[PDB]
Design a protein around this ligand. Structure first.
Ligand SMILES: O=C(O)c1c(Sc2ccccc2)c2cc(Cl)ccc2n1Cc1ccc(Cl)cc1
Ligand SMILES: O=C(O)c1c(Sc2ccccc2)c2cc(Cl)ccc2n1Cc1ccc(Cl)cc1
Ligand SMILES: O=C(Nc1ccccc1)c1cc([N+](=O)[O-])ccc1Cl
Lengths: 250, 240
């Protein structure tokens, strides 16, 4: 029956709002109290005032905020009906891989073709400034921006993304999973949830479900580059430290 | 209205049984099948440091518990109509007070029900621990003995725990008016329920409102201990 899921879709929006303070809705407003834009070396030196080299400072900046994003997605995951009940060793597995795919989804919410929100929306930072960095980091965030723009085209809601965020973490198709059946069953309901939500919220985006499920192809492909790229920067610069929570995931 | 109150009582009760798989009725039934843990040796058998592993299962369950509490607060009339920030606050603080209340329904003098009922840890086993954990649950056991002496049923608890949840004095509530507004309602319902289901028990109502002073005691003191437990996985620490 519908109300089964309609109400499940509600439970998850409400947790979504309660777990991530920068929503797609809040970003879209501040991308159309305006952000301080950074598009040059010095505008970064203002960015300190207003809100080791730059490419390394700015990389370590992506890392702190991601340690706090991983915090946010754990909080959200606990909320998902079933997840807390599952095997403990697999909870840790689902997050270990389920995190990054979530990140570059929420990322897209903060992105347009031109750049990316920063410091909780306080600032903006160009897609072309980023390209113009130090040899390893001049390619740090480029495919993100590419996928951001194709992914954002579906023009998803927050309420949509909350169920899709759910489906992601509860994969089953993940490496190291002892009990796969109960994961895959939670997801059968989340997919069932998601299906009706895309019909109702976006009644024109025909095969939006299909076209959304399709973007999990793009998403892993992104994670793969980030991993081996992230793996380089350790060899280039063993001076750099990583946060242990980020270590675990990686 | 004498009839409205009897309605809130039932809506709350009903939601409570859906919300909580293991009732105090059937937890009492069990207590008088369950695999007991009384030795170290029973333990390594029932699984199929050691002081650490036991503490940390209390953890995994304590987090399952939280979720079924959040599910249950949903059905409290107009709970959801509250400011979402305020919902988070009420749950955040009340959750612990309701865990020991429900941990009473699993406890008797000599130990506590385990694994959603399939087990029984001796109270004397629990007492027989290391200084970091050898009087961990000892305080708890005294609360539940005195608490269970009020012979509340789940019909009463289901109204009682709703009231814990909406206690309007929590740190950081933004709009306290409706929070107390509902609590006034659940109080009015709990009065009628205690006076109906136990007309023999005089001032039971008054006596339940004092154990809430105990609950706030046992919860700060437990807080105090899970920071003393910080004087002895990164992704898992974050889970808890
Ligand atoms: O501090 C920040 O919030 C920040 C930073 S770090 C920073 C912020 C202000 C001045 C200097 C550095 C960042 C760096 C990149 Cl290359 C991309 C996004 C960044 N952000 C925003 C952000 C980072 C990660 C995620 Cl998952 C979402 C938003
Ligand atoms: O998973 C359980 O059912 C359980 C546990 S979990 C456990 C069982 C066997 C060995 C180690 C941990 C538990 C531990 C303690 Cl020191 C006290 C009560 C405990 N329980 C009963 C319990 C029921 C509910 C909640 Cl909120 C917390 C604990
Ligand atoms: O030992 C326990 N919990 C715990 C474990 C790890 C971290 C924090 C609390 C426990 C706690 C409660 N409680 O606090 O309401 C109930 C049952 C077991």
């Amino acid at each position: 029956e519908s109300a089964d899921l309609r109400a499940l879709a509600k439970h998850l929006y409400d947790s979504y709002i309660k777990s991530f303070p920068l929503t797609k809705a809040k970003a879209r407003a501040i991308l159309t109290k305006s952000p301080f834009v950074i598009y040059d070396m010095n505008s970064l030196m203002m960015g300190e005032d207003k809100i080791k080299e730059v490419a390394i400072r700015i990389f370590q900046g992506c890392q702190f905020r991601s340690v706090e994003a991983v915090q946010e997605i754990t909080e959200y995951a606990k909320s998902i009906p079933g997840f807390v009940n599952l095997d403990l060793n697999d909870q840790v597995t689902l997050l270990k891989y389920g995190v990054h795919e979530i990140i570059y989804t929420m990322l897209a919410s903060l992105m347009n073709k031109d750049g990316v929100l920063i410091s909780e929306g306080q600032g903006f930072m160009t897609r072309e400034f980023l390209k113009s960095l130090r040899k390893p980091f001049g390619d740090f965030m480029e495919p993100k921006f590419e996928f951001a723009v194709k992914f954002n085209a579906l023009e998803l809601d927050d309420s949509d993304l909350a169920i899709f965020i759910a489906v992601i973490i509860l994969s089953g198709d993940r490496p190291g999973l002892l009990n796969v059946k109960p994961i895959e069953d939670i997801q059968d309901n989340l997919l069932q949830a998601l299906e009706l939500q895309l019909k109702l919220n976006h009644p024109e985006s025909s095969q939006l479900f299909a076209k959304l499920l399709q973007k999990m192809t793009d998403l892993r492909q992104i994670v793969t580059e980030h991993v081996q790229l992230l793996q380089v920067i350790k060899k280039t610069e063993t001076d750099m430290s990583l946060h242990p929570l980020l270590q675990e995931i990686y």
